[PDB]
């Protein structure tokens, strides 16, 4: 059981070592499309690339590339798209991907500015009466409503395909309180956020996969998916303590490199799952 494993790693302070074994065991697959010169300005970080086998393809004949990966967790019946915070020049691509994949939810785990630098373009409207048009992808986005709370904001958005005049409602889940350095002290507010996303229906198989991003789409984004999938496996399995976080992380890392960036984020993931298991058992 993971609780005893937690105490062991913690009491021995072995987190940096566990994390290094995961680094060394992690899959490595080609990422040739990401490294093409014509795609250089579609990547925020030169060291964070989608694998060719799991990359999301835009349905535009010119350039189908976006920095986004499909993570398919077969046993849990959960899919996620992990992507980078959009760039000024990829906001239109981001919303085209949301449209083409039939996603119902966008989960954002960063602020637009952290540590006095821009981590992300402002890719959604700030006011009802000031909608955004993406000329390159023929989409209109309108803020319908905004519900600001202590730890997170939920926004209802309407996305319109200007080519077909179809509209969809998108839910924007913005966790606003992840600290600039390190990880939250308690996982309580993160778990509350995760249960709110679940309650919306955004993670349900009647929709396209949820879009999850932070700045790089690997660290905080990784913690979100790892906790959701681990808790879902503990519901599904005859023996809940058969669930090995480290194995689940390595399965997820087949689909996108670098998920969970620090030993701190690994420890936090354990803590989130261990605590979330109490509300589930």
Curated annotation (Swiss-Prot):
Positions of post-translational Cysteine sulfinic acid (-SO2H) modification: 214
UniProt crosslink position (N,N-(cysteine-1,S-diyl)serine (Cys-Ser)): 214-215
Signal peptide start and end residues: none
Topology relative to the membrane: Peripheral membrane protein
Active site residues of this protein: 214
Residue positions where Cysteine sulfenic acid (-SOH) is found in the record: 214
Post-translational modification: Oxidized on Cys-214; the Cys-SOH formed in response to redox signaling reacts with the alpha-amido of the following residue to form a sulfenamide cross-link, triggering a conformational change that inhibits substrate binding and activity. The active site can be restored by reduction. Ser-49 is the major site of phosphorylation as compared to Ser-241 and Ser-242. Activated by phosphorylation at Ser-49.
Location of S-nitrosocysteine modifications: 214
UniProt-listed GO biological process terms: actin cytoskeleton organization; cellular response to angiotensin; cellular response to fibroblast growth factor stimulus; cellular response to hypoxia; cellular response to nerve growth factor stimulus; cellular response to nitric oxide; cellular response to platelet-derived growth factor stimulus; cellular response to unfolded protein
Single GO cellular component term: cytoplasmic side of endoplasmic reticulum membrane
Residues recorded with modification Cysteine persulfide: 214
Family: Belongs to the protein-tyrosine phosphatase family. Non-receptor class 1 subfamily.
Protein name: Tyrosine-protein phosphatase non-receptor type 1
Species, as recorded: Homo sapiens
């Amino acid at each position: 059981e993971m609780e005893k494993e937690f105490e062991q790693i913690d009491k021995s302070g072995s987190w940096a070592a566990i994390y290094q074994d995961i680094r060394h065991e992690a899959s490595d697959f080609p990422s040739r499309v990401a490294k093409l010169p014509k795609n250089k300005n579609r990547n925020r970080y030169r060291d964070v690339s989608p694998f060719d086998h799991s990359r999301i393809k835009l349905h535009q004949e010119d350039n189908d590339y976006i920095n986004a990966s499909l993570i398919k967790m077969e046993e849990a019946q959960r899919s996620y798209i992990l992507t980078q915070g959009p760039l000024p020049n990829t906001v239109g691509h981001f919303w085209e991907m949301v449209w083409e994949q039939k996603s119902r939810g966008v989960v954002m785990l960063n602020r637009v500015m952290e540590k006095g630098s821009l981590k992300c373009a402002q890719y959604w409207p700030q006011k009802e009466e000031k909608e955004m048009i993406f000329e390159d992808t023929n989409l209109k986005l309108t803020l319908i409503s905004e519900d600001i709370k202590s730890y997170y904001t939920v926004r209802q958005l309407e996305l319109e395909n200007l080519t077909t005049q179809e509209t969809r409602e998108i839910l924007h889940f913005h966790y606003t309180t992840w600290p600039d350095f390190g990880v939250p002290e308690s996982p309580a507010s993160f778990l509350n956020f995760l249960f709110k996303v679940r309650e919306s229906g955004s993670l349900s198989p009647e929709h396209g996969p949820v879009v999850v991003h932070c700045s790089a789409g690997i660290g905080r984004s990784g913690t979100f998916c790892l906790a959701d999938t681990c808790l879902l496996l503990m519901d599904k399995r005859k023996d809940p303590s058969s669930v090995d976080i480290k194995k689940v992380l390595l399965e997820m890392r087949k689909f996108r490199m670098g998920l969970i960036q620090t030993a701190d984020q690994l420890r936090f993931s354990y803590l989130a799952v261990i605590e979330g298991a109490k509300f589930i058992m």
